Amino acid sequence: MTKALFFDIAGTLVSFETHRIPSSTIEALEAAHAKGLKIFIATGRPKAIINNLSELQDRNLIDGYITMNGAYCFVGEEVIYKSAIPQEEVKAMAAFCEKKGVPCIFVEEHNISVCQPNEMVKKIFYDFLHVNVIPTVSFEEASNKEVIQMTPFITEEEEKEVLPSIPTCEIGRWYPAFADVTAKGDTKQKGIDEIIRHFGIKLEETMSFGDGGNDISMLRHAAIGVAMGQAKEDVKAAADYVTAPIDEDGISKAMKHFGII
Ligand SMILES: [Mg+2]
CATH class of the missing domain: 3.40.50.1000 (HAD superfamily/HAD-like)
Structure with a gap:
């Protein structure tokens, strides 16, 4: 039972x-x-x-x-x-998102940050899901943190583009505008x-x-x-x-x- x-x-x-x-x-x-x-x-x-x-x-x-x-x-x-996510894969996701011009959330055990939050974060996390505003940090700072989860605001197409740089992480998605990335x-x-x-x-x-x-x-x-x-x-x-x-x-x-x- x-x-x-x-x-x-x-x-x-x-x-x-x-x-x-x-x-x-x-x-x-x-x-x-x-x-x-x-x-x-x-x-x-x-x-x-x-x-x-x-x-x-x-x-x-x-x-x-x-x-x-x-x-x-x-x-x-x-x-x-x-x-925690392999540091190479944190760095590769940060570099990808910054190059592409899309935002990404980086979650540590006891801190959370967003890099370059734009209309997709506002529309989806704040306006739609009613998430409280996450503090902003630079992609350089994020790329050096011990990260448990990343939430890049990438489409499925963008996900396939960064995937070879993300060889061991899990990528969970329920919505088209973002995914959640965690370790193997x-x-x-x-x-x-x-x-x-x-x-x-x-x-x-x-x-x-x-x-x-x-x-x-x-x-x-x-x-x-x-x-x-x-x-x-x-x-x-x-x-x-x-x-x-x-x-x-x-x-x-x-x-x-x-x-x-
Ligand atoms: Mg759900």
């Missing part, structure tokens, strides 16, 4: 339309918590810019976090796994593995929930993967079950369907 739930944030817990968590989702997670489910966040975002979970956090419903696509995992105050093997699947290792939970007792391309590995890896109803077809194909759209009680309906609650 399911013992661990893994939830993506954007488009899974938090609506892109309201920037809020559906009421039925909060109710479902309260019910699951009381039944003893462990409830985990599994997001591409770094902790520093997770600014939209307060309704769950204030209710003390989250048992641990997979952040940065698996590159930074923690349970309470305890870090259980982290990674660091995907939300890795995050699941680290969390369940910590808790003594078997992979066969896991359930994941996602809407995006960066969820596909965790949708396949968990024993049961649930795709949100508005997800792209490749995300749905990776899942075992497709629930309703997020703003049509998709989380609650899935949890009820499986008897989680």
Whole structure:
């Protein structure tokens, strides 16, 4: 039976339309918590810019976090796994973005920065996703940092152009305007593995929930993967079950369907 739930944030817990968590989702997670489910966040975002979970956090419903696509995992105050990108690949991404004229976010363990933020950062991270403004630093400074995750604002075409300079990183994408880059093997699947290792939970007792391309590995890896109803077809194909759209009680309906609650 399911013992661990893994939830993506954007488009899974938090609506892109309201920037809020559906009421039925909060109710479902309260019910699951009381039944003893462990409830985990599994997001591409770094902790520093997770600014939209307060309704769950204030209710003390989250048992641990997979952040940065698996590159930074923690349970309470305890870090259980982290990674860093090979410096050559940080440098190559910085040089590429600066040459191309596109911005890039560089995330360290305890600092976050953006280089040359432009209309794409404003449009996508601030205006669309409601991320708080990230401090600016130069690409030269960024290129020298110990970086856990980079988020270049590159298209799929631009990604293929920089790819040979990025020979070992993982590149996770759910949206056409940016991708998240982490070190080899660091995907939300890795995050699941680290969390369940910590808790003594078997992979066969896991359930994941996602809407995006960066969820596909965790949708396949968990024993049961649930795709949100508005997800792209490749995300749905990776899942075992497709629930309703997020703003049509998709989380609650899935949890009820499986008897989680
Ligand atoms: Mg998502």
